[PDB]
C-alpha cells in the first residue's frame, strides 16, 4: 500500500504544531472560527455529553465548513505532539488532543489538500 489512510491531515497538524498555528481545545477552536484565524477543523468522534460536538458543528456551519471527523483525540495528540518527547519513537503520556483547529497552515499543497477539496465539493 502507498495511498494515505487519512494521513492528509496529520501532517498538516504536525506542521501547525511546528510553526505554532494550532487552536487546540474547544474555546480556542471557537475563537479561531469566529474571525479569520481558523481555516481547517478536526473534532473528536468520542465526544462526551455530545453538546460539545454539536457546538463544534454549529461553529463549522457559521459561514464556511472546515470540519473533518477522522478518528478520536489521543491518536491525533500522538501524531501532533503531547508530552515531553520521550526516547526515539512515541512513548509519551497518552492524553486526548480534544477538538483541534488549524491556523496559518505553513506547508503548501501535497496530498494534504486533495481530500479536503473533495469533502468541500459535492
Amino acid at each position: 500500500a502507498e495511498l494515505t489512510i487519512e494521513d492528509a491531515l496529520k501532517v498538516v497538524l504536525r506542521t501547525s504544531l511546528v510553526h505554532d498555528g494550532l487552536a487546540r481545545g474547544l474555546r480556542e477552536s471557537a475563537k479561531a472560527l469566529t474571525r479569520g484565524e481558523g481555516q481547517l477543523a478536526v473534532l473528536v468522534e468520542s465526544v462526551t455529553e455530545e453538546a460539545i460536538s454539536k457546538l463544534v458543528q454549529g461553529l463549522a456551519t457559521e459561514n464556511n465548513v472546515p470540519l473533518i471527523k477522522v478518528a478520536d483525540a489521543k491518536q491525533l495528540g500522538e501524531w501532533a505532539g503531547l508530552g515531553k518527547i520521550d526516547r526515539d519513537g512515541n512513548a509519551r503520556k497518552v492524553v486526548g488532543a480534544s477538538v483541534v483547529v488549524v491556523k496559518n497552515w505553513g506547508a503548501d499543497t501535497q496530498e494534504r489538500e486533495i481530500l479536503l477539496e473533495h469533502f468541500s465539493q459535492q
Binding site: 474547544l26 474555546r27 474571525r35 454539536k54 454549529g58 461553529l59 456551519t61
Partner: protein, 69 residues
C-alpha cells in the same frame, strides 16, 4: 539582627478556580448556531461581554469597556 515581629494576616493569591468552563454558547436543533450575550466591538468576535447590572467588560482588552448592552 533581631527577632522577627510577625503581625499575622496571611494572604494568598488566586488559584483561578477550574469551573464548568463553557455554557454561554448553544445549538437549538442543528443548523441554528445560537449565542448567549454579545461580542466585543473593540476587538473581533471570540470575546463575550461580561454581563452585570449596567457594567460590561472584556478580557482581551483586560478591562476597557463601559457601555450598557
Amino acid at each position: 539582627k533581631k527577632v522577627y515581629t510577625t503581625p499575622k494576616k496571611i494572604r494568598h493569591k488566586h488559584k483561578k478556580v477550574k469551573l464548568a468552563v463553557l455554557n454561554y454558547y448553544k445549538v437549538d436543533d442543528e443548523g441554528k448556531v445560537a449565542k448567549l450575550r454579545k461580542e466585543c466591538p473593540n476587538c473581533g468576535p471570540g470575546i463575550f461581554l461580561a454581563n452585570h447590572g449596567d457594567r460590561f467588560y472584556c478580557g482581551k482588552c483586560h478591562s476597557t469597556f463601559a457601555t450598557q448592552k
